[PDB]
Amino acid sequence: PIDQLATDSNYLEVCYILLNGEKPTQEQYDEFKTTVTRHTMIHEQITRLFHAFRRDSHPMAVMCGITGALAAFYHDSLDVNNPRHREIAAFRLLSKMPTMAAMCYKYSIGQPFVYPRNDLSYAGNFLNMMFSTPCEPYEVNP
Amino acid sequence: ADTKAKLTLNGDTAVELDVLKGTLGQDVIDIRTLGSKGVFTFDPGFTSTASCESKITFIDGDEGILLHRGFPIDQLATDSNYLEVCYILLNGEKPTQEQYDEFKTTVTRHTMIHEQITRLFHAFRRDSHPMAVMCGITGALAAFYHDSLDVNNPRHREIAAFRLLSKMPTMAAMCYKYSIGQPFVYPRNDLSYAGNFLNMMFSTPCEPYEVNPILERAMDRILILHADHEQNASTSTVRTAGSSGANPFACIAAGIASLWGPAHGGANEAALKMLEEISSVKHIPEFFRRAKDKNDSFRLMGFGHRVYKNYDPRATVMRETCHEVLKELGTKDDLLEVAMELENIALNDPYFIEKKLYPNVDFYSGIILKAMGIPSSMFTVIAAMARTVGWIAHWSEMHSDGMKIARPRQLYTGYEKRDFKSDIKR
Amino acid sequence: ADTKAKLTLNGDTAVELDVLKGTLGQDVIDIRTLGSKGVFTFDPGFTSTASCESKITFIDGDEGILLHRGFPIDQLATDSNYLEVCYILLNGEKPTQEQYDEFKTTVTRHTMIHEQITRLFHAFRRDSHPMAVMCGITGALAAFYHDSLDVNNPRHREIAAFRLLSKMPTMAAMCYKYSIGQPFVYPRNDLSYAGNFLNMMFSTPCEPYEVNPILERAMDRILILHADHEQNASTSTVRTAGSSGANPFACIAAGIASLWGPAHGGANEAALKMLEEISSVKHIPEFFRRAKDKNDSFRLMGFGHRVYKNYDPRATVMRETCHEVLKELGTKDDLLEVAMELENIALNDPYFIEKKLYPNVDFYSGIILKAMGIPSSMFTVIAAMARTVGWIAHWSEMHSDGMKIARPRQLYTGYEKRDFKSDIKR
């Protein structure tokens, strides 16, 4: 039931559950969480597509813009009929969305992009990528 | 207090002119009615015309007096820091710790400049004199900060004041980094205005930067001492651009330009021509260049000032400050004994002693900056940077009074109405 | 020959002042040496103070008279051309064939903007106002063309000027193309000033663009009617800034920011608030917006002007031209028939007869520009582009007048000296 999942679980485990059909053992969770963390940083050239969209752009128009241009950069994980390829894609898209969404916001407001922090939870990392700046430390309120 | 009531003008009919009094300085004759009464005075330069009523800065050159809201520049420089002087100048009073904290927090809240603006920097050629980049960047701000342009709206002037207040040190720091090829440094909240600026100018990503407490005070002082200087030329332009509607960002850009006009306006070799004759006649370790140079003297080298008669009041604490810095940067400040020699010259040479080419504030500032690795290309940027509060205040004041648009008269001396019949056929 | 002799000021004793006469208009009371007696005048706005002697343009506000070098505006606007008029403003007399042809040549050979400035443009937002971009690029011209900021050099000055006249249009049109998303167009040395501008405004790679003679002629008259307009706030801004030795460009950039100051300075909805209430109360096809809008009247919409009493002398030709163009573009300006109704309202509506809101030149310039297909925002841009030849005439006339530095006084009414004691710790 969505109720228990929301109260007793965190987003990352729900990702595992949804994708595999079962809840994760601490080991599977660690392994899943580490893989995700292993693919958070988006290629730097892609970050150059952001400076081509007008600043005024509704962030959601930039998200469709950036996501539809990924295939050009991540061209090796496109054999949809290949099982290993679907998996690499799953994690690529899984890991990088919070990164790109965070950039969409920063970009529209004129602040510098913030990189993914490994020592931060999926949710805390996102709060951190959306609101912190290089001018002062950001306190992720629990 | 003899005629602080009235007086009379007589052309063909006697006009009753009220005499207005100031709390310090000379009095004035309210002539805002002659115009209508078909009477105009003639004063190119406005040397005999009060352009406004002000409460910000009082000067008395003959006696070397300089007050910011009644406070002598000396105390302000020693007992205060740049940020408080900003508050004082802007509000007319010293701040209570609470008002200070609130003022200091707001400033801190607007230090980072929009990133797109940072993309205008890469369009200017690297070689650009930083001060040409500062007028370039400041005059392009209005395009980015388009919501704080209703100069007639009180909330708008305030947002601008802080925007321009907070971001100048940031932009000035970038102007320097850019010209030298190092990465830009962001504003640090845990750093004082002065220390943050030293940090934004000199640190790199390769090693931690140690803000020396000494230089940090010498910088602050440099900043307080260049805060404002009454209705000088650049400030007159500010109020003039502003009275004609012009947005705040554009006013400062205009002020900034009017400020360094005498820098390049002298000549491609004004005070530069002899900076090149320090190679063929360098047989004498001093009178070769910057001692035989000034054929056309310059207060821009730090000698003399058209305002103060015998001495620049601001230079007192600046000379003291200069001493500590040299006494700190130890074995890196030795060669700089030409400062010791130059002063001595400005003090004991008949010419100088005659035309009063006394060392002014910028003389000691320059040495401090020069002793700080800072390039002469940045000297103006700092002065203007610091002078920005002085401009914002004067701009804010002009509005409160009513932003009386600039519409001076002229004495037409050209042709009388003549007929036109094209002399060309092309 | 009345009081053309002298006059006297009496504080408690007499003082005799001259009364220099002009070739036209009012003569002025010379008060140049008063300052050297402590005696000062008080005149915020300078409306009873001749700030200079000029021989460029003459205006008798009440007689609706506009003279340029003596040549009636309507005579130039009808039988001359922009450059020939530019030559008259800068040279004081109508040119010979050789003088003109020479001038023209020089102007077409320097109409390009450094390839590096193209990049600056790109660093701006696409949604930026074409006027802001316009200020930004002009305030940044100093960081590039750094071979002519020496104001005291007639060579530099003459070059600096010629660059502005040649490049301003290229610049103005480029703000447009960037504002709409079309590629920039390079000038054509074969076309006229006006025809060349229209081409850069509307030329597209897709095919050759042919300018309409009536449209080409119309634009040239829009320019002529904007080339100069005496000592207004914007020219005074160019004059004051220049008095300090500020490079040519910085002074031109201030004139622009000053020229549209009344526009943005109004407010996010000054003459815009009611431009939004044309949706809920559009039951009446006219008095709904631009007929019920002005609660705080505006000469910026084309109604009235402080300078003239009954009419604008520039509106004569511009209106006649306005008829030929609507007539020409015919079935494209059928809808823009509200032009005669606003002209009708201004003329008859009591609210306009009461406030003397007569259609000035910007009323019909606006009509012609809308007809040609030029966005509203591009109006003060084109207006400023046209006025720059005038700004240069003044700024240059100023640099020949011994260049008196604008150093005004002030009625100081603030705190008398008082010691400073800070009660904070931060």
Short mmCIF file of N, CA and C in Angstrom, two decimals, chain C residues 247-356:
data_model
loop_
_atom_site.label_atom_id
_atom_site.label_comp_id
_atom_site.label_asym_id
_atom_site.label_seq_id
_atom_site.Cartn_x
_atom_site.Cartn_y
_atom_site.Cartn_z
N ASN C 247 35.52 59.63 -21.49
CA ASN C 247 35.63 59.29 -22.90
C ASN C 247 34.30 59.46 -23.62
N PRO C 248 34.36 59.80 -24.91
CA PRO C 248 33.22 60.03 -25.81
C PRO C 248 32.08 59.03 -25.69
N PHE C 249 32.41 57.75 -25.78
CA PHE C 249 31.41 56.70 -25.72
C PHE C 249 30.64 56.68 -24.40
N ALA C 250 31.35 56.67 -23.28
CA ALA C 250 30.69 56.67 -21.98
C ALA C 250 29.67 57.82 -21.90
N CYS C 251 30.02 58.96 -22.49
CA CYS C 251 29.13 60.12 -22.48
C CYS C 251 27.92 59.91 -23.38
N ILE C 252 28.10 59.18 -24.48
CA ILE C 252 27.00 58.88 -25.39
C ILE C 252 26.09 57.84 -24.73
N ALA C 253 26.69 56.89 -24.02
CA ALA C 253 25.93 55.85 -23.34
C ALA C 253 25.05 56.44 -22.24
N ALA C 254 25.53 57.50 -21.58
CA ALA C 254 24.75 58.14 -20.53
C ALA C 254 23.56 58.90 -21.15
N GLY C 255 23.78 59.48 -22.33
CA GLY C 255 22.72 60.20 -23.02
C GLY C 255 21.57 59.27 -23.37
N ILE C 256 21.86 58.01 -23.68
CA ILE C 256 20.82 57.04 -24.00
C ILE C 256 20.03 56.64 -22.75
N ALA C 257 20.75 56.23 -21.71
CA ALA C 257 20.12 55.82 -20.46
C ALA C 257 19.29 56.97 -19.92
N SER C 258 19.75 58.18 -20.20
CA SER C 258 19.07 59.39 -19.78
C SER C 258 17.84 59.64 -20.64
N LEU C 259 17.96 59.38 -21.93
CA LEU C 259 16.86 59.58 -22.85
C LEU C 259 15.64 58.70 -22.57
N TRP C 260 15.84 57.45 -22.14
CA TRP C 260 14.66 56.63 -21.86
C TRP C 260 14.31 56.58 -20.39
N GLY C 261 15.03 57.35 -19.58
CA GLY C 261 14.76 57.37 -18.15
C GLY C 261 13.28 57.56 -17.84
N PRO C 262 12.60 58.49 -18.53
CA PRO C 262 11.18 58.72 -18.28
C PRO C 262 10.31 57.49 -18.58
N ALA C 263 10.83 56.59 -19.43
CA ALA C 263 10.11 55.37 -19.82
C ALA C 263 10.05 54.33 -18.71
N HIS C 264 11.19 53.75 -18.36
CA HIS C 264 11.22 52.75 -17.30
C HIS C 264 10.99 53.40 -15.93
N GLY C 265 11.44 54.64 -15.80
CA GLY C 265 11.29 55.40 -14.56
C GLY C 265 9.85 55.62 -14.16
N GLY C 266 8.94 55.46 -15.12
CA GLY C 266 7.53 55.63 -14.84
C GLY C 266 7.14 54.56 -13.83
N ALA C 267 7.16 53.30 -14.27
CA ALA C 267 6.80 52.16 -13.42
C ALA C 267 6.32 50.99 -14.28
N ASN C 268 6.44 49.78 -13.73
CA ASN C 268 6.00 48.56 -14.41
C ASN C 268 4.59 48.69 -15.02
N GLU C 269 3.90 49.77 -14.69
CA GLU C 269 2.55 50.02 -15.21
C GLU C 269 2.17 51.50 -15.14
N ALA C 270 3.14 52.39 -15.35
CA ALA C 270 2.88 53.83 -15.32
C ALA C 270 1.91 54.18 -16.44
N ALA C 271 2.35 53.99 -17.67
CA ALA C 271 1.52 54.24 -18.84
C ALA C 271 1.23 52.84 -19.38
N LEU C 272 1.44 51.86 -18.51
CA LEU C 272 1.25 50.45 -18.84
C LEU C 272 0.08 49.82 -18.09
N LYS C 273 -0.20 50.31 -16.88
CA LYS C 273 -1.29 49.77 -16.06
C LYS C 273 -2.60 49.64 -16.82
N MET C 274 -2.97 50.69 -17.55
CA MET C 274 -4.21 50.71 -18.32
C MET C 274 -4.06 50.00 -19.66
N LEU C 275 -2.84 49.62 -20.02
CA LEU C 275 -2.59 48.91 -21.26
C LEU C 275 -2.96 47.45 -20.98
N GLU C 276 -3.43 47.21 -19.76
CA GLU C 276 -3.84 45.89 -19.30
C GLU C 276 -5.35 45.85 -19.10
N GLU C 277 -5.95 47.02 -18.88
CA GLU C 277 -7.39 47.14 -18.67
C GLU C 277 -8.12 47.35 -20.00
N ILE C 278 -7.55 46.80 -21.07
CA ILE C 278 -8.14 46.91 -22.40
C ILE C 278 -8.77 45.56 -22.70
N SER C 279 -8.94 44.76 -21.65
CA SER C 279 -9.52 43.43 -21.79
C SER C 279 -10.86 43.29 -21.08
N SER C 280 -10.97 43.90 -19.90
CA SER C 280 -12.20 43.83 -19.12
C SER C 280 -13.20 44.94 -19.45
N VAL C 281 -12.70 46.09 -19.88
CA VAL C 281 -13.56 47.21 -20.23
C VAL C 281 -13.46 47.59 -21.70
N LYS C 282 -13.21 46.60 -22.55
CA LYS C 282 -13.08 46.83 -23.99
C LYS C 282 -14.44 46.93 -24.68
N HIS C 283 -15.45 47.38 -23.94
CA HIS C 283 -16.80 47.52 -24.49
C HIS C 283 -16.86 48.75 -25.40
N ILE C 284 -15.94 49.69 -25.17
CA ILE C 284 -15.84 50.91 -25.96
C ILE C 284 -14.46 50.89 -26.64
N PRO C 285 -14.44 50.71 -27.98
CA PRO C 285 -13.25 50.64 -28.85
C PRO C 285 -12.24 51.79 -28.86
N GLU C 286 -12.10 52.50 -27.74
CA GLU C 286 -11.13 53.59 -27.68
C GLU C 286 -10.84 54.10 -26.28
N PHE C 287 -11.86 54.63 -25.61
CA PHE C 287 -11.69 55.14 -24.25
C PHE C 287 -11.41 54.03 -23.25
N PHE C 288 -11.27 52.80 -23.74
CA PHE C 288 -11.01 51.66 -22.87
C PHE C 288 -9.60 51.62 -22.29
N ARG C 289 -8.61 52.00 -23.10
CA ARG C 289 -7.22 51.99 -22.68
C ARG C 289 -6.55 53.33 -22.93
N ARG C 290 -5.89 53.46 -24.08
CA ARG C 290 -5.18 54.67 -24.44
C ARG C 290 -6.13 55.85 -24.66
N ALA C 291 -7.08 56.01 -23.75
CA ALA C 291 -8.05 57.10 -23.82
C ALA C 291 -8.67 57.30 -22.45
N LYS C 292 -8.28 56.45 -21.51
CA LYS C 292 -8.75 56.52 -20.13
C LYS C 292 -7.53 56.20 -19.28
N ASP C 293 -6.50 55.74 -19.96
CA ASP C 293 -5.23 55.36 -19.36
C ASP C 293 -4.60 56.51 -18.58
N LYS C 294 -4.06 57.48 -19.31
CA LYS C 294 -3.38 58.62 -18.71
C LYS C 294 -4.12 59.32 -17.58
N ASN C 295 -3.80 58.89 -16.36
CA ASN C 295 -4.35 59.48 -15.15
C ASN C 295 -3.23 60.45 -14.79
N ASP C 296 -2.02 60.03 -15.16
CA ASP C 296 -0.80 60.79 -14.97
C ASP C 296 -0.26 60.96 -16.40
N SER C 297 -0.83 61.92 -17.12
CA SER C 297 -0.46 62.22 -18.52
C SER C 297 0.99 61.94 -18.92
N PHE C 298 1.23 61.69 -20.18
CA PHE C 298 2.56 61.46 -20.72
C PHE C 298 2.82 62.01 -22.12
N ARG C 299 3.97 62.66 -22.27
CA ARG C 299 4.40 63.22 -23.54
C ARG C 299 5.21 62.12 -24.20
N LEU C 300 5.26 60.98 -23.51
CA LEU C 300 6.07 59.89 -24.00
C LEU C 300 5.18 59.09 -24.98
N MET C 301 3.86 59.25 -24.86
CA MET C 301 2.88 58.60 -25.74
C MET C 301 2.56 59.46 -26.98
N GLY C 302 3.13 60.67 -27.01
CA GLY C 302 2.92 61.57 -28.13
C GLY C 302 1.98 62.74 -27.90
N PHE C 303 1.75 63.11 -26.64
CA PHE C 303 0.85 64.21 -26.33
C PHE C 303 1.48 65.31 -25.48
N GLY C 304 1.68 66.48 -26.08
CA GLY C 304 2.27 67.61 -25.39
C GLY C 304 3.79 67.58 -25.28
N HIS C 305 4.34 68.56 -24.58
CA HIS C 305 5.78 68.66 -24.35
C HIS C 305 6.06 69.92 -23.53
N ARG C 306 7.00 69.80 -22.60
CA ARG C 306 7.34 70.92 -21.74
C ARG C 306 7.96 72.09 -22.50
N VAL C 307 8.76 71.76 -23.52
CA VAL C 307 9.45 72.77 -24.30
C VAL C 307 8.53 73.75 -25.05
N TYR C 308 7.55 73.20 -25.77
CA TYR C 308 6.64 74.02 -26.57
C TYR C 308 5.30 74.31 -25.93
N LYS C 309 4.79 75.50 -26.20
CA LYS C 309 3.52 75.93 -25.63
C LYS C 309 2.27 75.44 -26.35
N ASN C 310 2.17 75.74 -27.64
CA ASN C 310 0.99 75.34 -28.39
C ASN C 310 1.18 74.17 -29.33
N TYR C 311 2.40 73.99 -29.82
CA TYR C 311 2.69 72.91 -30.74
C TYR C 311 4.18 72.60 -30.89
N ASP C 312 4.45 71.44 -31.47
CA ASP C 312 5.80 70.96 -31.72
C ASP C 312 6.13 71.37 -33.16
N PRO C 313 7.24 72.10 -33.38
CA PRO C 313 7.56 72.49 -34.75
C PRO C 313 8.04 71.31 -35.60
N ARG C 314 8.29 70.19 -34.94
CA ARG C 314 8.77 68.98 -35.58
C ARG C 314 7.62 68.11 -36.07
N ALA C 315 6.43 68.37 -35.54
CA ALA C 315 5.26 67.61 -35.91
C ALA C 315 4.70 67.96 -37.29
N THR C 316 5.12 69.09 -37.85
CA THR C 316 4.63 69.52 -39.17
C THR C 316 4.96 68.55 -40.30
N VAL C 317 6.24 68.35 -40.56
CA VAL C 317 6.67 67.44 -41.61
C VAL C 317 6.34 65.98 -41.28
N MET C 318 6.56 65.60 -40.03
CA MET C 318 6.31 64.23 -39.59
C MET C 318 4.86 63.80 -39.80
N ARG C 319 3.93 64.74 -39.71
CA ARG C 319 2.51 64.43 -39.92
C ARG C 319 2.25 64.29 -41.42
N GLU C 320 2.79 65.21 -42.21
CA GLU C 320 2.62 65.17 -43.66
C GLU C 320 3.18 63.85 -44.19
N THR C 321 4.31 63.44 -43.61
CA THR C 321 4.99 62.20 -43.99
C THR C 321 4.17 60.99 -43.54
N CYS C 322 3.52 61.16 -42.40
CA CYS C 322 2.69 60.13 -41.79
C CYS C 322 1.51 59.80 -42.69
N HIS C 323 1.06 60.77 -43.47
CA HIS C 323 -0.06 60.56 -44.39
C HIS C 323 0.41 59.77 -45.61
N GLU C 324 1.54 60.18 -46.20
CA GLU C 324 2.08 59.51 -47.38
C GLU C 324 2.37 58.03 -47.13
N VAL C 325 2.86 57.72 -45.93
CA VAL C 325 3.21 56.34 -45.56
C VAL C 325 2.01 55.43 -45.33
N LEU C 326 1.04 55.90 -44.55
CA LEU C 326 -0.16 55.10 -44.30
C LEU C 326 -0.82 54.87 -45.65
N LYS C 327 -0.81 55.92 -46.46
CA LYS C 327 -1.36 55.91 -47.80
C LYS C 327 -0.61 54.89 -48.66
N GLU C 328 0.72 54.88 -48.53
CA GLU C 328 1.59 53.98 -49.27
C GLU C 328 1.39 52.51 -48.87
N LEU C 329 1.61 52.23 -47.59
CA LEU C 329 1.45 50.88 -47.07
C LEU C 329 -0.01 50.46 -47.13
N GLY C 330 -0.86 51.41 -47.50
CA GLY C 330 -2.29 51.19 -47.64
C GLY C 330 -2.97 50.13 -46.80
N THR C 331 -3.34 49.02 -47.45
CA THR C 331 -4.03 47.91 -46.79
C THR C 331 -3.17 47.13 -45.80
N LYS C 332 -2.56 47.85 -44.88
CA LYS C 332 -1.74 47.26 -43.84
C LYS C 332 -1.86 48.21 -42.65
N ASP C 333 -2.35 49.41 -42.94
CA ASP C 333 -2.54 50.43 -41.92
C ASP C 333 -4.00 50.87 -41.89
N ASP C 334 -4.90 49.96 -42.25
CA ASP C 334 -6.32 50.26 -42.24
C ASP C 334 -6.78 50.25 -40.78
N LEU C 335 -6.29 49.26 -40.04
CA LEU C 335 -6.61 49.10 -38.62
C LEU C 335 -6.08 50.27 -37.79
N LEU C 336 -4.89 50.74 -38.15
CA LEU C 336 -4.24 51.85 -37.46
C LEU C 336 -4.95 53.15 -37.85
N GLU C 337 -6.28 53.11 -37.78
CA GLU C 337 -7.15 54.24 -38.09
C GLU C 337 -7.50 54.94 -36.78
N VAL C 338 -6.98 54.39 -35.69
CA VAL C 338 -7.20 54.95 -34.36
C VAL C 338 -6.31 56.18 -34.25
N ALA C 339 -5.41 56.32 -35.22
CA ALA C 339 -4.48 57.43 -35.27
C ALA C 339 -5.22 58.76 -35.41
N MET C 340 -6.27 58.77 -36.21
CA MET C 340 -7.03 60.00 -36.41
C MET C 340 -7.97 60.26 -35.24
N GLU C 341 -8.32 59.20 -34.51
CA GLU C 341 -9.21 59.33 -33.36
C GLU C 341 -8.47 59.83 -32.12
N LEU C 342 -7.21 59.43 -31.97
CA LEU C 342 -6.40 59.88 -30.84
C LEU C 342 -6.04 61.32 -31.15
N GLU C 343 -5.83 61.59 -32.44
CA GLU C 343 -5.49 62.93 -32.90
C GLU C 343 -6.75 63.77 -32.73
N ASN C 344 -7.90 63.12 -32.91
CA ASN C 344 -9.19 63.78 -32.76
C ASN C 344 -9.39 64.09 -31.28
N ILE C 345 -9.25 63.07 -30.44
CA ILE C 345 -9.40 63.24 -29.00
C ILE C 345 -8.46 64.31 -28.44
N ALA C 346 -7.19 64.25 -28.80
CA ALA C 346 -6.22 65.22 -28.31
C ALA C 346 -6.65 66.64 -28.67
N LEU C 347 -7.08 66.81 -29.92
CA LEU C 347 -7.52 68.11 -30.43
C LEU C 347 -8.82 68.65 -29.82
N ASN C 348 -9.82 67.77 -29.66
CA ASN C 348 -11.12 68.17 -29.14
C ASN C 348 -11.44 67.82 -27.69
N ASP C 349 -11.16 66.59 -27.28
CA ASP C 349 -11.43 66.19 -25.90
C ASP C 349 -10.94 67.31 -24.99
N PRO C 350 -11.81 67.78 -24.08
CA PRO C 350 -11.49 68.86 -23.14
C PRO C 350 -10.30 68.55 -22.24
N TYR C 351 -10.11 67.27 -21.94
CA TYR C 351 -9.02 66.85 -21.08
C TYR C 351 -7.67 67.14 -21.73
N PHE C 352 -7.65 67.12 -23.06
CA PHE C 352 -6.44 67.38 -23.82
C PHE C 352 -6.28 68.87 -24.14
N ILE C 353 -7.39 69.57 -24.29
CA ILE C 353 -7.34 70.99 -24.57
C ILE C 353 -6.94 71.68 -23.27
N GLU C 354 -7.34 71.09 -22.15
CA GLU C 354 -7.05 71.63 -20.82
C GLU C 354 -5.58 71.46 -20.45
N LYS C 355 -5.04 70.27 -20.67
CA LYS C 355 -3.65 70.01 -20.34
C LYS C 355 -2.74 70.31 -21.53
N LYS C 356 -3.33 70.82 -22.61
CA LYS C 356 -2.58 71.16 -23.82
C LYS C 356 -1.79 69.98 -24.37
#
